[PDB]
Each structure stands twice: as C-alpha cells, then as structure tokens.
Design a protein around this ligand. Sequence first.
Ligand SMILES: *[C@H]1O[C@H](CO)[C@@H](O)[C@H](O)[C@H]1NC(C)=O
Lengths: 10, 250, 29
Amino acid sequence: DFEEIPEEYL
Amino acid sequence: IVEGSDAEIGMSPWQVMLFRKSPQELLCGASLISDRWVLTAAHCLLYPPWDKNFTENDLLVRIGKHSRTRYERNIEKISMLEKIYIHPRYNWRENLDRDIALMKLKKPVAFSDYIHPVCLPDRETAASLLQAGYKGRVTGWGNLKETGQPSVLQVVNLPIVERPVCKDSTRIRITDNMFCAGYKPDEGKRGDACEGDSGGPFVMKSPFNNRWYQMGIVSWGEGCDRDGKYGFYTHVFRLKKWIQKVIDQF
Amino acid sequence: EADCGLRPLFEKKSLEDKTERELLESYID
Ligand SMILES: *[C@H]1O[C@H](CO)[C@@H](O)[C@H](O)[C@H]1NC(C)=O
C-alpha cells in the first residue's frame, strides 16, 4: 500500500 | 500513535521515516539531528529475539514526510545510509537499556520548510524540562490501535511520569537511561505511542529559548494506551556522551 | 546547527501550532 518511490533511490 | 491527532504541516520537520527497501514497509520512526545524522532506537536495527538485524543497504531514510504511504513529490527527500552505529551496551537481552542508534547519511540533506533538525539537550535543558508533569510531544506513523494505520503523521502530547509510578507499573527492570510518560487512569485523558512509532522522537519546547529539544526516543511499552501502563522512552541526555563521541569520531 | 529546533513554518515566522500552548502550561517553573 506504499506508493512506489523513484527508481533512483533503488 | 493511539488517541493522538493529525499533525499540522511542518509541525515536526525533524521527523524521519525509516523505510524498508524490500519489501517496502514502514520500519520505524527516527529524527534528524543535523544535515547528515539521524537518531533512532537501536531495536529498529538490531533485535535478535525477533531475528531483526538490518544493515545500511537494507533501508532508506525518508525526510520531510506527512502522508504515510505516498511518495511526496517535491517535498520529501529520500536518503541512503552510509553507516549505522548502535550503542555497544544496548541491552536487547533484557530490558532494552540504552535503546539508541545513529545513522550517517551518504550525502547531506537540504533543509526546507518541511525538513529541519531538532536540538539535543545539554544538562541544564534536561534538568529544566525533564520533570514529572511536564509534557512532551510524540509523533509517528505507527498503529492507531493496539489491536489500523494513519493516513498522515500523528501527534500526541503526554506528561512525564514520576519514576516510582513508572517502576510500579511494570515487572520490567527500569534504568536511569529510561523515562516514562502518559496519563494516569485518574487523569481521564489518553494517548500513547505504539507499534511503528518505535525510534521516533519525544520532544519538548524550551520556554527559555523557545527551541524544540528531543528528550526521548520511543522505545517500548506493554500493549498501547492501556490503563495504568506507560510508554517508555530512551533518555537522550543520559546517552549524550556516546552521541558526541560517535559524531566527533565519524 | 545553531538553528536547530526552530521550525520554518512556526517559530521562524512567529506562528504557533495548535497544541504547543498545552506544553507551555505544563512547564510550571
Ligand atoms: C546480525 O547482524 C549482522 C549481519 O547483518 C551480523 O554481523 C551480527 O553479528 C548479527 N548480530 C549481532 C548481535 O550484531
């Protein structure tokens, strides 16, 4: 249920 | 946080969310104490009775957050861990004595309207404010009940409790490195930290210089917001020497 | 950080949040 974060943060 | 309320925007800009990379979950609370150092509870990282042992690359620090689950674009900053330092006499076998840890960020975080460090107490501050009946403030994205989860950061103000009442409320061995806070059944009002609030800050606002100080770290409790039970917090000023040495060293 | 514990959206603009007065009233000394 957590929105995905930017791939940069891995 | 049980029986607390939604935080205001920018109300606790030192609030950090420790976030697990995989799977993506809330790990714990934490606080920003400089542009590169984050304070949390050691049990957030190391708790072998539950097989918890996290290293740097297992997680991320999310700073400037308000919503629990959303990626708050253009507001939060997500940082990587360079190193974790747990108190070497942290006592996970027994009672979580010296429940404290530091994390160094890979790069400094930029301060903003939503991101700003809290102060750490010196002796006069602690002696001035750490008094039975004085209230501090605890914040977190943890459980709303002992037995769901909040949409946004929660806040609760709680009074510090006399040491004898703390001791008499529990069979656990309380140390000088802990204090407890919360209302007594007679007081009528309610509120506590809970599961997921672990690691986050207990702060007080000095009436002398009107700065916010982190006096405590959310450490443990028996159940949450139970009548006659209190929340237990790490005593930040008692562990200040260790904090200074680690920061001065590394 | 010599500016620690001063919130941009509150202390730095002389705004108070909704429950900080509750803490102040408990600081009876
Ligand atoms: C488990 O954590 C690390 C591995 O992440 C390991 O080196 C360590 O010895 C273990 N437990 C202790 C008490 O740190």
